Amino acid sequence: RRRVRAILPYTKVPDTDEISFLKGDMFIVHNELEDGWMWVTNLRTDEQGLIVEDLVEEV
Amino acid sequence: SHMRRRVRAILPYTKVPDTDEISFLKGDMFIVHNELEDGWMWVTNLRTDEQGLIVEDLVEEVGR
Numbered sequence A: 001r002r003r004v005r006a007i008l009p010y011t012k013v014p015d016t017d018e019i020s021f022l023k024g025d026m027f028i029v030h031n032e033l034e035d036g037w038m039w040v041t042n043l044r045t046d047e048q049g050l051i052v053e054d055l056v057e058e059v
Numbered sequence B: 001s002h003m004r005r006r007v008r009a010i011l012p013y014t015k016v017p018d019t020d021e022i023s024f025l026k027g028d029m030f031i032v033h034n035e036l037e038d039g040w041m042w043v044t045n046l047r048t049d050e051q052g053l054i055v056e057d058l059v060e061e062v063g064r
Helices: none
Strands: A003-006 A026-031 A037-042 A047-052 A056-058 B006-009 B029-035 B040-045 B051-055 B059-061
Antiparallel strands (some): A003 A026, A026 A037, B006 B029, B006 B059, B029 B040
């Protein structure tokens, strides 16, 4: 249960469970998943969803 | 296509031994990482955090 930060923005793939975000957004990681993905909650939008792991860094 | 979606088990499943299928309980949720051309998919079970193969016939999309 750690916080990670977006280093770049991301626009979700339509009709999927991915979420869009902005550089600087903070997320709480719920599941690491396979390398390359993460199941998280974006603290700014309060949205739970799938994100691309290479766009976030440890804080 | 269930790619990049969260899906939920509609029935339990016990893996075939010596395969990389994963056993799961009804209600378990998963994130789909790869969809193979036979209905099977590489996923992560959100409860156990294990990666493995599950078949699409046993799950339904539930959204975020």
